[PDB]
Design a binder for this molecule. Structure first.
Ligand code: CNC
Length: 330
């Protein structure tokens, strides 16, 4: 007829969630093919004729449907992973963080500025319940990333909290907790069924705290801490990630750092050196073993991704949205 055929996502590509400026409404989604090395920006806007919203935080792909969590627009959009077109949405979310699917019929949505985890039925798009976290307020509340062991979801508590919680999905109740250093940022489960989390500093002039941050290996069966790796005061680490095998752990602390999940010690040498910039998100390809590093670079201008081989040679670098912070494989 007339207009050029719409953009489609063929193949085993990569969504990049760009946070945008908080309060400025300029969050965007990007898509990248590793084979083609072509990035498409603003795919949500261009597909739906509608701005993504305000702090685009995270994403999960589930049977060709992508669940994109817009933290500060109080929403999660279901999109086609082929078309990027909205197929449905979940609204009325305090300030969502991450979504974890127990089943098709039930998922948990963590929140900041709330003491509850929301329970939804993804097939109806409806809230089904709430999970009251102990010793938590609406004023300082924070749930974040999740992993499942058996019948249990574990979840780290970040902004002005110092805990990992343990939830029985049979009852949807918190049944156990573990205190760690302040503001654990992230959580992953390795091939040995050990969780890893890394704290940030707090910040200079926090009313909650400012201490030395730490990486923790934790057994999933027994919920006990096995190691701790303490770093410098004024470090502010973030975004722990695993490779596809779950035997190589990576995190951000000025540089990108890498450690085999086996072995008792933090390597001397990073995976990738500091650049007087703000490395901010991170992922590993489950096909290639390749490492993508999201640079926010000053948090103002258009950000960049940097792609490296498992063995540390630069493959590609490409411009995305403002403050890229998270990835999701298709
Ligand atoms: C830098 C930064 C960022 N932060 Co802070 C983080 N960590 N933050 C910080 C640091 C600021 C040090 C500094 N001034 O450089 C740091 C660690 C101290 C901080 C503090 C906080 N932050 C916090 C959070 C949760 C967030 N932060 C982001 C704004 C989050 C950003 C991510 C994002 N997508 O925006 C972020 C990575 C980039 C913001 C920025 O510097 N923009 C550059 C430039 C454009 O500045 P801007 O327009 O004026 O932005 C200002 C604000 O963002 C302010 N600010 C920073 N964080 C917050 C948080 C809140 C709640 C408010 C009202 C303002 C801020 O600092 C900037 C001053 O110019 C956030 C979007 C990150 C995320 N995606 O989860 C998220 C807020 C989302 C929400 N719904 O609340 C803390 C609650 C974390 C904590 N418990 O320690 C805390 C709040 C303290 C406060 N209100 O003063």
């Amino acid at each position: 007829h007339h207009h050029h055929h719409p953009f489609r996502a063929t193949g085993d590509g990569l969504f990049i969630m760009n946070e945008g400026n908080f309060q400025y409404g300029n969050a965007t989604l990007s898509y990248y093919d590793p084979e083609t090395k072509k990035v498409e920006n603003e795919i949500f806007y261009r597909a739906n004729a509608m701005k993504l919203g305000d702090v685009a935080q995270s994403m999960i792909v589930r049977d060709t449907i992508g669940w994109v969590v817009v933290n500060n627009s109080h929403v999660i959009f279901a999109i086609s992973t082929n078309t990027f077109k909205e197929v449905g949405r979940i609204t009325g979310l305090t300030s969502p963080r991450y979504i974890h699917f127990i089943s098709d019929e039930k998922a948990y949505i963590t929140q900041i500025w709330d003491y509850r985890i929301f329970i939804v039925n993804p097939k109806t798009y409806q809230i089904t319940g709430y999970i009251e976290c102990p010793d938590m307020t609406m004023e300082t509340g924070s749930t974040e990333q999740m992993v499942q062991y058996g019948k249990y979801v574990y979840v780290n508590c970040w902004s002005y909290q110092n805990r990992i919680l343990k939830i029985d999905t049979t009852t949807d109740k918190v049944v156990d907790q573990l205190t760690v250093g302040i503001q654990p940022t992230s959580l992953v489960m390795d091939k040995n069924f050990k969780m890893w989390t890394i704290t940030d500093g707090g910040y200079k002039g926090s009313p909650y705290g400012y201490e030395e941050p730490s990486l923790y290996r934790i057994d999933a069966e027994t919920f006990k801490i096995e190691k701790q790796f303490k770093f410098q005061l004024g470090d502010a680490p973030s975004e722990v990630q695993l490779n596809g095998a779950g035997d190589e752990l990576y995190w951000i602390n000025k540089d990108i750092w890498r450690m085999s999940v086996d072995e008792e010690r933090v390597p001397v040498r990073p995976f990738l050196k500091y650049r007087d910039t703000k490395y901010y998100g991170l992922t590993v390809s489950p096909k290639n073993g390749d490492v993508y590093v999201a640079d926010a670079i000053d948090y103002q201008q258009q950000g960049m991704i940097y792609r490296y081989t498992e063995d540390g040679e630069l493959v590609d670098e490409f411009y995305v949205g403002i403050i890229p912070g998270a990835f999701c494989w298709k």
